[PDB]
């Protein structure tokens, strides 16, 4: 079955580092330099064996064709109003990038406002972030090339969609917030660094600053408004209060849902914005999240997790700011996570809750917090919303496993608040009625009950005969909720597959306690939860080890790679996308320093001892038993993934191929594909998305020998 040879890869046996007395050899450390001839040759040789492997069987072509057909459906974002105009994003079906449209009224003819597709041949220039001026007459937008986190901000006058000369460089992980006087916009930039800043570099990102750009000037004239030179990892994002009176500064360090909150009454500036603002340090620690919802004069409504792991709404009066004085507007729910809150039509609050990994949406009174209206939803997720304080209507977008979903509209000026379907699209070829979604709760090793969604064709016999695709993430307070995936439904329909999503600890599904259950000393909980999910699917007859594929990306790539090391006997196939593989060195590169709040840092003896136990790069080991080998493994990364630098996957695949791949009993392939002009994934053009899923399921089909079902 394996008709290729793994490439020659030099081992630097002298590359030995001492971590608190524990010696670690890193023979592929040289793969950390993306620019070397050695690394470039390594990538070329690896792609040279992977691509022919993926493309040998006609299944790739059948899948690609079906994906191209089925993914070709109209894709809309919610309408949103800015000034006197409406905007929405729309893809006719197969455009590489969705297009931003404008209309002068809801019944008015729409026209193209911003079309990213004309910015490159291959759709690899993508919108990343945008902000309209308060009056809706000016527009700032970020552009990222080749999938990099790096942004260039450009500007337009909305009337006539006129290009303006303003260009902002060195923007990354940035806010965009216009002052309501329409003079300029806050944003973040990083200082100059040696070498490249295009997404191919690994340089750590420190000393992010907050600037104010006056429209009509050169970037070099921009005002420095906040900086933290004594705290190089701090990141301060600005937003304007709804009345335009205050700049709110949310300072973060790491990835925990916490922030400092400082404010600036702009009217108290001595002569407008001219330098470091007169910041008032309302919350000056990282003990809780304070997410601005709205204010009425000095009374500020925040979504918080302070003493409230499932989140709640509090009012803090800037004139009486001590914690003991804060008012609880909407108390914490016992179990349901308050995901997000928006203020609309002056005195309404839109609250979105997560109840057992499904969304609900409710309208509350701002003055009392009292529930006023429940917006009815089927089982699934709210993935889009519009309606700001001055707006008198909302739009919201619902999606689920089995249908692309619906945009709803609700006119909030009406006495009876009845939502109506505004836009709905169905995909011909995938009849939702043929499939079912079930939710179960399985006990993990320590007895903790974990949610899992299972999607499958109705009427299947649970005889262990079905191929299964089990997805997980498990970290960073991210909740993995139902979403429409054409690519996964093709696996079900055309490969006879069962889909599963395990809501393992580390995620946000049951609030901050769920998140804390899968981080730091307890990261092993994630891997245990995920392995127990696999065991559930097997025990209950959905699948069998040899027919089971697991998949995850980034922190999810770490998840599946670790599970391959820990329980190789459990899985037939592993697809790890853009994964964090070197847990000892992740903090050294680009923004990886931010992830130590979930993982710890190997600089600490205590943390090193957690990390060394599960680090994928450091736990590649031949299975003891003669009858057990590693699952088939495919690593996917890209050369501009500056979120998770590709060296992670490069070093990991060299290690897999050397330790496991050289062994006689290993007949399952261990492969990497490194894409070009792509990065971590956000903004990836449609054409590349299609290639990627075609690669993924062709890999599964070849390794598990699955026949296409027409």
């Amino acid at each position: 079955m394996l008709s290729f040879q793994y490439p020659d890869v030099y081992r630097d046996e002298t590359a030995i580092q001492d971590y608190h007395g524990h010696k670690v050899c890193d023979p592929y450390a040289w793969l950390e330099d993306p620019d070397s001839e050695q690394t470039k040759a390594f990538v070329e040789a690896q792609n040279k064996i992977t691509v022919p492997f993926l493309e040998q069987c006609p299944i790739r072509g059948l899948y690609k064709e079906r994906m191209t057909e089925l993914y070709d459906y109209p894709k809309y974002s919610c309408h949103f109003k800015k000034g006197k105009r409406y905007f929405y994003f729309y893809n006719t079906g197969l455009q590489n990038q969705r297009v931003l449209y404008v209309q002068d009224s809801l019944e008015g003819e729409a026209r193209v406002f911003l079309d990213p597709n004309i910015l490159s041949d291959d759709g690899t220039v993508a919108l990343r972030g945008y902000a309209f001026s308060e009056d809706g007459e000016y527009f700032a937008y970020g552009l990222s090339a080749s999938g990099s986190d790096w942004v260039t901000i450009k500007f337009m006058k909305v009337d006539g969609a006129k290009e303006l000369p303003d260009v902002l460089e060195r923007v990354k992980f940035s806010c965009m917030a216009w002052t309501h006087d329409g003079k300029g916009m806050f944003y973040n930039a990083y200082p100059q660094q040696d070498g490249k800043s295009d997404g191919t570099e690994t340089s750590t990102n420190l000393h992010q600053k907050l600037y104010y750009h006056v429209l009509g000037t050169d970037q070099s004239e921009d005002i420095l408004c906040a900086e933290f030179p004594d705290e190089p990892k701090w990141m301060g994002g600005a937003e304007l209060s709804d009345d335009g009176r205050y700049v709110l500064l949310s300072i973060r360090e790491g990835c925990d849902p916490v922030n400092r909150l400082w404010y600036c009454d702009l009217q108290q500036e001595s002569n407008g914005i001219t330098g470091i603002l007169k910041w008032v340090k309302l919350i000056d620690n990282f003990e809780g999240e304070y997410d601005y919802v709205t204010n009425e004069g000095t009374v500020f409504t925040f979504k918080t997790n302070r003493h409230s792991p499932n989140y709640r709404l509090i009012n803090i009066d800037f004139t009486d700011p001590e914690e003991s004085k804060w008012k609880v507007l909407v108390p914490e729910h016992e179990k349901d996570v308050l995901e997000w809150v928006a203020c609309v039509r002056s005195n309404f609050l839109v609250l979105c809750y997560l109840h057992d990994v499904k969304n609900t949406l409710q309208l509350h009174d701002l003055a009392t917090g009292a529930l006023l209206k429940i917006f009815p939803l089927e089982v699934g997720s709210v993935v889009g919303y519009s309606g700001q304080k001055k707006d008198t209507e909302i739009f919201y977008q619902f999606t689920s496993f089995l249908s692309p979903g619906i945009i709803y509209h609700c006119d909030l000026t009406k006495e009876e608040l009845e939502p109506r379907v505004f836009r709905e699209v169905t995909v011909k070829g995938i009849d939702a009625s043929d499939y079912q979604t079930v939710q179960i709760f399985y006990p993990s090793k320590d007895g903790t009950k974990i949610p899992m969604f299972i999607v499958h064709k109705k009427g299947i016999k649970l005889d262990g005969s079905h191929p299964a695709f089990l997805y997980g993430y498990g970290g960073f307070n991210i909740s993995i909720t139902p979403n429409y995936s054409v690519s996964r439904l093709i696996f079900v329909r055309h490969m006879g597959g069962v889909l599963a999503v395990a809501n393992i600890r580390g995620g946000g599904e049951y609030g901050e306690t769920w998140h804390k259950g899968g981080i730091l000393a307890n990261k092993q909980n994630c891997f245990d939860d995920f392995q127990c999910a696999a065991e559930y699917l097997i025990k209950e007859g959905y699948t069998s080890p040899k027919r089971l594929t697991i998949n995850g990306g980034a922190n999810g790539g770490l998840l599946v790679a670790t599970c391959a090391n820990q329980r190789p006997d459990l899985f037939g196939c592993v697809i790890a996308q853009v994964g964090v593989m070197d847990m000892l060195k992740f903090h050294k590169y680009t923004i990886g320093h931010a992830w130590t709040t979930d993982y710890g840092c190997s600089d600490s003896k205590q943390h090193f001892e957690w990390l060394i136990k599960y680090s994928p790069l450091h736990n590649v080991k031949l299975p003891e038993a003669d009858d057990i080998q590693y699952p088939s493994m495919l690593l996917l990364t890209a050369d501009h993934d500056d979120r998770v630098v590709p060296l992670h996957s490069l070093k990991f695949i060299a290690t897999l191929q050397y330790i496991v791949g050289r062994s006689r009993k290993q007949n399952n392939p261990l492969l990497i594909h490194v894409d070009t002009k792509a990065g971590h994934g956000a903004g990836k053009p449609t054409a590349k998305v299609i290639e990627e899923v075609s690669d993924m399921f062709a890999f599964i089909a070849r390794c598990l020998n699955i026949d296409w079902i027409p």
């Binding site: 992980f173 991210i478 980034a554 964090v580 992830w595 998770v644 956000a682």
Partner: peptide, 4 residues
Amino acid sequence: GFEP
């Protein structure tokens, strides 16, 4: 959004 700077999580992995």
